[PDB]
């Protein structure tokens, strides 16, 4: 509803996140501020392959 | 009762009022005549950054000498709004209204050149595209600077590189005083939205 | 830079030149249920290279909270995840010549830690985790950043 | 209208919707003298509700 | 081969810079370019976000903290919580600013007033009149062992003030349950047993179609009309039940209030202020001006 | 790319304020507004009648 | 003076010049090339009607 | 749009493709505010890819 | 018969020469001719070639020799071949110029710097920023009895330089296989047993959308940033295997390098230089200025 | 919202009173009237004939 | 071509008849860049061979 701001709030009460090596267990799903309608403002993907 | 500190997302409005857009549109029809819904149109408008900008004759002046202060002041919309953002792109437009109170020569003429930003006049040639006016028949020198950039966006901070975007160089054969108004082209805009700075209000002197 | 110089990532960036990356951040907080408080985690691009009147420092609580951030309450949000996008005006970060940072992350105190008028137990402990996202390593080179 | 000027008048005439001798004593509804309600009949309001690219600065 | 003119004599006006203050029109600015049809592309893959950050609804929709109050176990019921921050308990409802501090430096003592604006206030300062639906998120920083009842009621019209020579502030003595009963006021009684939060939207109500964007600018004992005329009313936050807290937790809680606006309308592109829009650049030390 | 002019020489008259005493015409008054198409609405619910 | 120019600004009614800024929209003319300064003031009002 | 000026506006209005109250709090995609991709929608790019005689100096 | 005017008052601006710096528009130049529609015909049977010699792709596509190196049997492996010409072994990748000589004449000693540009460099000097795919044809002048292996590898970024008071040059000590390994560099190992030639196209790669066209103009110990910022990197030509040659042939070979550009883009029609575009007219003798 | 000019530079001539001696043409005389389209009617029942 | 100016460009664009990236290295026939042969495509030549009354002074 609001912009640029994550507001403290409740969430699901059993959150397991896995990031590529590590596995997080949290009491509730974290409050996450991501970027709205994000796009790639670089050209590296156009220069060569990774 | 259960022991917990939680958030139920309770929301309330205080009146059985009509649709806000109805009332707003009626109020505009009755007391404004227009509707501002975006702040880019304000960058398309021209606003004054200096009512008296004095120049010395036969001197190539980069307009940075002025904008570097007119941006920190916050008087125009291109400056006031810049304090809300971190990026910008696009070109700019400047108008120079002549306010010269004396006749310096039988032929007064004004000339504008391009120049990379943050350069000096002794660091650039006078070739390239140009615009020339004669304040006696046309006291308004209107010019536009495109977005000639090595980068798709320009930050509002200091960089290691220099000359990565274009600016304006101003020349005159006589000492002219001018009202300077600037604005953005049909392609200028800002980037990230960030927090606000503090605002300065009325100032007073008090002989305590 | 804070992440590239951590976790042995510089070893896997070595012999490369350009990088486009989004930074992923995660806090994990712990406080006994008898302790309260609130923090604001915000990021300011070019805060170390922009004029002071434009910094997230040197402005007001309202301005600070107007920056992109997350509320971190002790008894509501024991963990928060933040994503900072690619922040360079350039087409990619230079890992060899341009040793530079483009965004500064801050952790602010809205309300101080509130506990009983005791001792050693009225406290809160945090731990910050960082990694990268939306990555692209493209052009190889023989040069290195001595700053790793 | 017989006019030897190709531009018969300075402006484009707008119809009213009135059924009364304008110089007469009978009342004239002032809303029937012109149509300018909250609709696309108004230029800026049509610009807004039609989402043109100029209200955004483009 | 060389016929005669048949055109009429055009009447003209040498008026350069006609409508340069408008946002729409055909600009006579000469481009220092190669192509007259020079034009950048669209904004795909320029900024980190494909959202329009320049719309008034996206800026005035960015909330900011304006109040952090301290509700102690001593705070009396039906008395505004006035501990911790300025404008204690009272919340002038409006897009303009209501709070300002005075920086006094020196003979003489030069006084300049500073403001702490949210994005809605930053935007409103650019115009003369405003109209909007004001939204407030009232959060309480507590534990599961603090309990209490909080009353947030809306009162329309001017605010009781203790007017000073350089600022304005609320009179907490005219806001007690005796002088200011909430029995005939729109309000929301919030229980703190488990919940912590309530968002409150206040639609626009006034005998005016648009209020002023002046606010506290130049507001003091002598200049006080525009301030009262810049707001639709005020909220007051009073305890219905004293704060309940054992001695195992804090004897106080912090009340955080976020502010933003919805259904926004701005009227005149000129401020109402004595002077221009000016950004406060904090000097290096306290001796500078 | 840069062709030559083919228009004729317009004859003109520097007569500002032409027909300002008439009720009909296109006014050259500059509006101190935001929109050039600034225009109030109709008179519904303005006056008592 | 070698350059005479005329300028018009907005202002709330019944104010003084020391009570208002000089920002906002404006119109400027040069009486020597255009001796007629034509300007229009919109109805920027808090009220739908204004009494006399 | 009821206008007594034959030229109802200074410019030619361009449609957006937006489904939102522009003064509302909901996000607005800035790409739907105008169509200016890498296409013949841009004047100089259309000039190039259409091979007009002016880009050659004729 | 004589009706009244119904036109409005045109607003105007006495701005002669509006957009004269653009390439497109309607010119108000009066022709000293008979017909206003004077126009030459098309170019059939005017020039010896019906090709367009004015397109950037046809000019920047005309190659020119920029390096003639001498690879002796003494040249060490994994060391750049630095004998015979300036900028030995190193090839700054870009449309601008990288090489210049100083003509010093006389009291005082006036120094003017001269450039040796290929058509791509001549064109780039006319603009502020460039972007292109740089193509290099590396030929070896040898016999069927010379053998060897040649390593041409691309390194992105600034170049190691020995900066002087009036010029810049490569530091050959920071380009040896010890300090500058080619193990993580795009490269092409060329066998000289029978072949002599390899054409190498280097696409545009940089953290900038456009590089500068300044190059070596005014480049020296103090002014060195724009030079580094005018190129995407550099090639280095190092022997993988020493030159093999019996005593019946020359103990050296000449490495000829042609340079041209493809997929060219130029941005600003104004140079980035301190001064204008100036052509060096070699004086009659060495005493002139 | 504020695009660029694409019109050319008009050539002109400040020649007021062009063809005032002719009987046909568009007169630049300002009427001291209310309506710009002020025009009398036809001659029915004005003169005896 | 999305232009808010009714006059999208200063001039009337003329087509070429070219099948090549103009900034490319491949040759471009300069006769396909414009059609101006000895024909009625040229204004004065069309005036002559069409026998207009202006070439005679009328």
UniProtKB/TrEMBL annotation, chain B:
One of its GO terms (molecular function) is structural molecule activity. This is Structural polyprotein. Its main location: virion. The lineage of its organism: Viruses, Riboviria, Orthornavirae, Pisuviricota, Pisoniviricetes. It is found in: Virion. The keyword Magnesium does not apply. Residues 25-203 form the Dicistrovirus capsid-polyprotein C-terminal domain. It comes from Kashmir bee virus. It comes from the Viruses. Keywords: Capsid protein, Virion. GO terms for cellular component: viral capsid.
TrEMBL record, chains D, H, K:
It is found in: Virion. This is Structural polyprotein. Residues 3-58 form the Capsid protein VP4 dicistrovirus domain. The chain holds residues 323 to 380 of 888 of the full protein.
Automatic annotation (TrEMBL), chain G:
The chain holds residues 662 to 713 of 765 of the full protein. This is Structural polyprotein. It comes from Kashmir bee virus. It comes from the Viruses. It is found in: Virion.
């Amino acid at each position: 509803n609001v912009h640029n701001t994550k507001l403290a709030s409740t969430s699901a009460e059993n959150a397991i996140e896995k990031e590529q090596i590590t596995t997080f267990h949290d009491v509730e799903t974290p409050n996450r501020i991501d970027t709205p309608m994000a796009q790639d403002t670089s050209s590296a993907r156009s220069m060569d392959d990774t | 009762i259960n022991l917990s500190n939680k958030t139920d997302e309770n929301t309330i409005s205080f009146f059985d009022s009509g649709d806000p857009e109805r009332m707003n549109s009626e109020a505009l029809m009755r007391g404004c005549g227009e509707q501002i819904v975006n702040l880019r149109p304000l960058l398309r408008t021209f606003r004054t950054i200096n009512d008296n900008w004095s120049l010395a004759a036969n001197t190539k002046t980069p307009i940075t000498d002025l904008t570097n202060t007119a941006d920190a002041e916050g008087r125009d919309y291109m400056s006031y709004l810049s304090f809300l953002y971190r990026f910008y792109r696009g070109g700019r437009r400047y108008k120079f209204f002549n306010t010269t109170p004396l006749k310096q020569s039988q032929t007064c003429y004004v000339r504008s050149f391009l120049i990379p930003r943050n350069y000096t006049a002794d660091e650039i040639n006078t070739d390239g595209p140009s615009h020339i006016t004669y304040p006696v028949i046309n006291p308004v020198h209107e010019v536009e600077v495109p977005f000639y950039s090595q980068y798709r966006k320009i930050p509002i901070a200091s960089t290691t590189d220099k000359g990565y975007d274009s600016s304006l160089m101003y020349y005159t054969n006589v000492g002219t005083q001018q009202i300077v108004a600037r604005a953005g082209n049909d392609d200028f805009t800002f980037g990230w939205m960030i927090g606000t700075p503090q605002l300065q209000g009325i100032t007073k002197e008090v002989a305590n | 830079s804070t992440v590239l110089k951590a976790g042995g990532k510089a070893q896997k960036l070595a012999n490369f030149k350009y990088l486009r990356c989004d930074v992923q951040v995660k806090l994990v907080l712990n406080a006994n249920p008898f302790i309260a408080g609130r923090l604001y985690l915000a990021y300011s691009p070019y805060d170390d290279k922009v004029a002071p009147e434009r910094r997230i420092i040197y402005t007001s609580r309202a301005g600070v909270t107007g920056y992109p951030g997350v509320e971190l309450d002790f008894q509501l949000d024991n963990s928060v995840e933040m994503t900072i996008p690619y922040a360079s005006f350039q087409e990619a970060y230079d890992l060899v010549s341009g040793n530079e940072d483009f965004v500064q992350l801050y952790l602010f105190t809205i309300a101080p830690v509130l506990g009983p008028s005791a001792s050693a137990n009225s406290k809160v402990d945090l731990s910050v985790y960082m990694w990268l996202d939306n990555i692209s390593l493209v052009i190889p080179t023989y040069r290195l950043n001595p700053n790793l | 209208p017989t006019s030897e000027n190709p531009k018969i008048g300075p402006i484009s005439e707008v119809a009213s919707g009135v059924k009364t001798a304008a110089n007469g004593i009978e009342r004239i509804p002032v809303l029937g003298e012109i149509a300018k309600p909250v609709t696309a009949a108004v230029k800026w309001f049509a610009d807004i509700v039609g989402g043109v690219a100029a209200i955004f600065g483009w | 081969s060389k016929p005669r003119n048949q055109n009429q004599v055009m009447p003209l006006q040498n008026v350069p810079g006609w409508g340069y203050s408008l946002y729409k029109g055909i600009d006579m600015s000469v481009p220092l370019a190669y192509d007259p049809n020079n034009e950048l592309g669209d904004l795909r893959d320029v900024f980190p976000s494909a959202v329009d950050e320049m719309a008034i609804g996206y800026v005035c929709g960015n909330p900011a903290i304006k109040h952090v109050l301290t509700w102690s176990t001593t705070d009396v019921v039906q008395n505004p919580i006035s501990n911790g921050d300025d404008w204690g308990g009272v919340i002038p409802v409006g897009m303009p600013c209501y709070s300002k501090t005075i920086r006094a430096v020196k003979a003489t003592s030069t006084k300049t007033e500073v403001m702490d604006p949210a994005p809605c206030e930053y935007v409103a300062n650019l115009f003369s009149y405003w109209r909007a639906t004001m939204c407030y998120r009232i959060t309480v920083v507590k534990t599961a062992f603090h309990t209490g009842r909080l009353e947030i009621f809306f009162e329309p019209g001017s605010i009781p003030t203790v007017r000073t020579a350089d600022n304005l502030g609320p009179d907490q003595t005219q806001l007690n349950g005796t002088i200011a009963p909430s029995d005939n006021n729109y309000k929301y009684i919030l229980d703190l047993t488990n919940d912590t939060e309530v968002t409150i939207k206040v639609p626009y109500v006034s005998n005016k179609m648009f209020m002023k964007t002046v606010g506290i600018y130049g507001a003091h004992d002598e200049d006080n009309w525009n301030f009262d005329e810049s707001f639709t009313g005020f909220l007051c936050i009073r305890p219905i039940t004293k704060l309940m807290a054992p001695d195992t937790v804090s004897q106080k809680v912090s009340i955080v209030v976020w502010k933003w606006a919805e259904d926004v309308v701005v009227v005149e592109p000129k401020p109402l202020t004595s002077g221009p829009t000016q950004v406060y650049n904090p000097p290096a030390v306290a001796r500078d001006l």
